[PDB]
Design an enzyme around this catalytic site. Structure first.
Site, PDB file in Angstrom:
ATOM      1  N   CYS A  60      -1.370   0.761  -9.077  1.00  6.56           N
ATOM      2  CA  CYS A  60      -0.222   1.664  -9.118  1.00  6.56           C
ATOM      3  C   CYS A  60      -0.315   2.790  -8.097  1.00  6.56           C
ATOM      4  O   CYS A  60       0.717   3.369  -7.739  1.00  6.56           O
ATOM      5  CB  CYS A  60      -0.066   2.252 -10.520  1.00  6.56           C
ATOM      6  SG  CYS A  60      -1.345   3.442 -10.982  1.00  6.56           S
ATOM      7  N   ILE A  61      -1.513   3.115  -7.619  1.00 13.11           N
ATOM      8  CA  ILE A  61      -1.694   4.120  -6.581  1.00 13.11           C
ATOM      9  C   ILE A  61      -2.185   3.503  -5.280  1.00 13.11           C
ATOM     10  O   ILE A  61      -2.493   4.237  -4.332  1.00 13.11           O
ATOM     11  CB  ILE A  61      -2.638   5.243  -7.044  1.00 13.11           C
ATOM     12  CG1 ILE A  61      -4.024   4.680  -7.357  1.00 13.11           C
ATOM     13  CG2 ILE A  61      -2.060   5.959  -8.256  1.00 13.11           C
ATOM     14  CD1 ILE A  61      -5.051   5.739  -7.695  1.00 13.11           C
TER      15      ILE A  61
END
Ligand code: ZN
Ligand code: ZN
Ligand code: ZN
Lengths: 216, 694, 30
Positions: B669-670
């Site tokens: 997600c990052i």
């Protein structure tokens, strides 16, 4: 082959540098042969790279220390014996006025006049460190290229082909504009618009700047 | 923050361009003066027909020397650039004097320091003297186009004025003509029949040439201009590099009640002939391309710019991305989805939920949740996108509610729909595929499903031509091209009465059955001496548009359910491919430029500098399937975006204190990858190949 | 070698010569 022409071979048959320098350590140009084994400390002079080693893997080393032509140790040097000078000049006189071999460059793309003036500019720097008194080492440095330049410059074919070099009716084998027949017609127009003046500028620079010992 | 000549020259040229634009706007109101000016303003002067002609003669007299200056400079610059391009394709690329050498990069020369100032000026002067008498063979010319910013403003102003005055069957059938996405303005397109596919459309033969920085010229063929021999300067190709010679040619070719105001129509006449801006654009094509490459941030920001109108990929993709961001943030309606990691229940739940959600859209965010699996980040949506892409592209069966949806027509990696006796289920599946592509375009993601060029051109609303058939099946495209070329031979009927082809075709298994006629009355009309163009165009439009009309209409309606008819305007097939599918293959240079290398170990093995080199050598010495598995381990996607703006989190590799016990961990997600520092390069390679397989 | 191994964060101070294509790179500076 362009390096097998009789005029070019007749010009580059000079006396080997061991014949006028013994075990001394003068400043020369040093060539290396992979084929003959002149690799680490064994060296050879420039006339060795011309007459000797013609089809070999011979190159020029930039980091050149002093050396004294160890060419006779590893192979049979063909330049230890000089022939008759007057017959050589007479052969050059007869070949200049009977054939058309002066307009053909060698395998490096050089005209005969450029090769002769580069030989003169090299030999002027190299020959000033000659001290007058296994092969014989008691002969003078060779003086043939000066007379060859003086004879070739008195001709309206060699000067014409040298000055009109890189034009439309003169093909240089080591130029990108020589073989353009497989390209698009617009690229052929753009490449045929211009003319080449690199070798003429090199010849003029070698005649004016690098030859500061004569005016003739 | 220092005084410079070029800043003042560019500012004065910008002021001149502003005044020339104002003059053009004033001269454009003459034929509608009595309606726009002498009907609203209480104070206006009376304008006659002869006064407009006197004004036109005055303005054409007072813009001569700047026109001569600009035309001479642009002609010399184009001659130098064209000679450089001619010398590039005739020389040895291994030589350091070649234009396509690594030593000619300006950024590589500055980084190599960590030649002299006299030598640069001496080379510039020697190039200046050799260019006077056309004595510049086998030498690359010395010039700097980045120091010519003041010329570009004057050129833009004069093209603005010219464009403002100008705007104020068998073989000759519109099926064998290229569209605006494959032609050049003011240039002759190549012959579609006498040129083979290897040097006419090289993108069809090599599909891997599509890059975000790729030029148009090496993707669609070399254009030609018919300008040679004609006494005017604009009818002769510029071949001389000298500014003085070009100025000499320009000047020598230079000095070689009545009707109502509505009937006044100005004509462009600088040099005794009518001048169109199309041939001026085609005359200086390389200079205009380089001007658009290096002068977009300031010169291209002017109103009515010709560089923005002739913009490439980066001009259009930025406008599309900012419009997508604005339309995404306009609304606040969310979409949720629950799926499971399989094929049949995944596609069934996808069809059911996508029908239940608006069974134009205003989707703000898309949230995907995997059944019996954790995770709520943004990479779950990318994993869902690549999962639904590989589920739709796979060839097993149809999971109830029978033929597979897509097939390859002859080029590997590209797909076209299969009709297969279309029921209501297949049409709804294609509408769902179109809506999936629409949400993928809206949410700034990549869906790894690849279509052919004509399939994209149906969705964008563009006319399909004969050159689009080369992207469908190249070998029989070449065979039909040779059939056209042999159909005009001198023997005529000798080769026609050899095979005796008819107007019926035998279709393949994926397209349907076989023995289907093209025209009415069927097989009883053989090939005449002159019907072959008609047979080719009916065959091409039958195999590209008739068989799969309903799936293409369904996908077009599905794409239009989410996206309006104001964003697909001025889009092309190739930037649609680059925006949805990314760059295709994975390269090392862009992956190097995308990484950040966060350091948190605190270990100082020669200030690192060797683990990073070993890592990039491992990536550069890696097969492309393992590269796609590597990129799937970074951000849960098998492809990279076309630019840096496609990454809403920036990519990040983060080092760890050394521990030779565990595989590197991924935070999707990052877009972060935590890697532990190792000792051996072989150990690093083995750990990477074990980690990417999962 | 000579190629940087990470992003330089674009460093500002750009003249547009890095945006030139590979075929026309000898005609621009800085
Ligand atoms: Zn040898
Ligand atoms: Zn010797
Ligand atoms: Zn020898």
């Amino acid at each position: 082959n362009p390096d097998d022409s009789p005029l070019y071979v007749l010009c580059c048959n000079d006396t080997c540098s061991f014949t006028w320098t013994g075990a001394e350590h003068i400043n020369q140009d040093i060539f290396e042969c992979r084929t003959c084994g002149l690799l680490e400390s064994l060296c050879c002079c420039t006339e060795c790279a011309r007459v000797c080693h013609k089809g070999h893997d011979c190159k020029l080393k930039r980091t050149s220390p002093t050396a004294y032509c160890d060419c006779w140790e590893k192979c049979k040097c063909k330049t230890l014996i000089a022939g008759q000078k007057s017959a050589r000049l007479d052969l050059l006189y007869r070949l200049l006025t009977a054939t058309n071999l002066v307009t053909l460059p060698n395998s490096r793309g050089e005209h005969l006049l450029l090769f002769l003036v580069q030989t003169v500019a090299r030999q002027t720097v190299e020959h000033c460190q000659y001290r007058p008194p296994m092969p014989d080492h008691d002969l003078e440095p060779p003086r043939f290229a000066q007379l060859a330049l003086e004879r070739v410059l008195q001709d309206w074919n060699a000067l014409k082909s040298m000055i009109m070099f890189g034009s439309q009716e003169n093909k240089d084998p080591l130029s990108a504009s020589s073989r353009i027949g497989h390209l698009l017609p617009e690229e052929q127009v753009y490449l045929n618009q211009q003319s080449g003046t690199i070798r003429l500028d090199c010849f003029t620079h070698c005649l004016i700047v690098k030859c500061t010992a004569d005016i003739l | 923050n220092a005084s410079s000549y070029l800043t003042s020259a560019s500012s004065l040229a910008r002021a001149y361009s502003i005044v020339i634009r104002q003059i053009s706007d004033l001269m454009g109101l003459i034929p509608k003066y009595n309606h726009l000016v002498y009907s609203q303003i209480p104070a206006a002067v009376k304008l006659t027909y002869q006064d407009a002609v006197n004004l036109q003669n005055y303005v054409e007299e007072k813009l001569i020397p700047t026109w001569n200056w600009m035309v001479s400079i642009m002609d010399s610059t184009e001659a130098q650039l064209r000679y450089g391009s001619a010398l590039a394709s005739a020389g040895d690329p291994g030589h350091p004097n070649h234009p396509l050498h690594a030593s000619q990069n300006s950024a590589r020369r500055e980084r190599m320091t960590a030649m002299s100032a006299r030598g640069d000026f001496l080379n510039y002067a020697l190039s200046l003297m050799r260019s006077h008498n056309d004595e510049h063979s086998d030498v690359l010319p010395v010039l700097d186009v980045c120091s010519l910013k003041h010329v570009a403003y004057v050129f833009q102003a004069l093209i603005y004025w010219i464009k403002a005055m100008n705007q104020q069957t068998g073989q000759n059938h519109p099926f064998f003509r290229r569209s605006d996405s494959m032609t050049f303005l003011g240039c002759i397109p190549p012959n579609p029949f006498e040129v083979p596919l290897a040097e006419a459309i090289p993108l069809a033969d090599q599909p891997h040439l599509l890059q975000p920085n790729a030029r148009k010229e090496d993707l669609f063929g070399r254009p030609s201009q018919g300008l040679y021999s004609d006494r005017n300067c604009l009818e002769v190709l510029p071949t001389k590099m000298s500014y003085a010679a070009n100025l000499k040619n320009v000047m020598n070719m230079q000095n070689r009640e009545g009707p109502p105001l509505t009937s006044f129509r100005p004509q462009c006449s600088f040099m005794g002939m009518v001048i169109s801006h199309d041939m001026l654009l085609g005359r200086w094509r390389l200079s205009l391309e380089l001007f658009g490459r290096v002068f977009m941030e300031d010169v291209g920001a002017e109103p009515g710019s010709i560089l923005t109108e002739l913009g490439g990929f980066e001009v259009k993709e930025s406008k599309f991305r900012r419009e997508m961001e604005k339309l995404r943030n306009q609304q606040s309606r969310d979409l949720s989805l629950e799926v499971d990691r399989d094929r049949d229940l995944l596609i069934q739940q996808t069809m059911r939920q996508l029908n239940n959600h608006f069974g134009p859209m205003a989707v703000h965010r898309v949230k995907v949740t995997f059944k019996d699996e954790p995770g709520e980040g943004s990479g779950v949506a990318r994993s869902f996108y690549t999962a639904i892409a590989q589920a739709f592209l796979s060839n097993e069966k149809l999971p109830n509610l029978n033929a597979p949806l897509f097939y390859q027509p002859g080029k590997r990696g590209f797909y076209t729909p299969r009709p297969g006796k279309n029921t209501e289920a297949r049409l709804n599946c294609f509408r769902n595929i179109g809506r999936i592509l629409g949400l993928c375009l809206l949410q700034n993601e990549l869906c790894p499903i690849t279509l052919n060029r004509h399939v994209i051109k149906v969705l964008l609303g563009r006319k399909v031509n004969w050159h689009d058939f080369a992207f469908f099946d190249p070998v029989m495209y070449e065979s039909l091209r040779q059939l056209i070329l042999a159909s005009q031979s001198s023997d005529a009927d000798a080769v026609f009465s050899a095979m005796d082809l008819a107007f019926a075709i035998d279709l393949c298994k994926e397209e349907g059955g076989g023995q289907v006629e093209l025209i009415p009355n069927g097989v009883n009309i053989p090939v005449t001496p002159q019907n072959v163009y008609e047979y080719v165009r009916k065959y091409a439009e039958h195999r590209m548009l008739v068989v799969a009309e309903q799936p293409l209409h369904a996908m077009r309606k599905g794409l239009l359910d989410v996206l309006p008819k104001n964003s697909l305007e001025d889009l092309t097939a190739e930037d649609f491919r680059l925006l949805v599918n990314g760059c295709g293959e994975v390269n090392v240079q862009m992956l190097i430029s995308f990484t950040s290398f966060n350091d948190e170990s605190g270990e100082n093995a020669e200030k690192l500098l060797q683990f990073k080199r070993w890592f990039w050598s491992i990536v550069e010495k890696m097969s492309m399937t393992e590269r796609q598995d590597l990129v799937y381990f970074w951000t849960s996607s098998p492809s990279l975006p076309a630019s840096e703006e496609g990454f809403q989190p920036m990519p990040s590799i983060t080092i760890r204190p050394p521990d030779d016990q565990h595989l590197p961990t991924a935070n999707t997600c990052i877009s972060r990858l935590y890697v532990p520092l190792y000792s051996s390069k072989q150990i690093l390679k083995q750990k990477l190949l074990l980690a990417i397989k999962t | 070698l000579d190629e940087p191994l990470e992003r330089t964060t674009n460093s500002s101070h750009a003249n547009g010569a890095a945006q030139a294509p590979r075929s026309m790179q000898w005609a621009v500076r800085n």
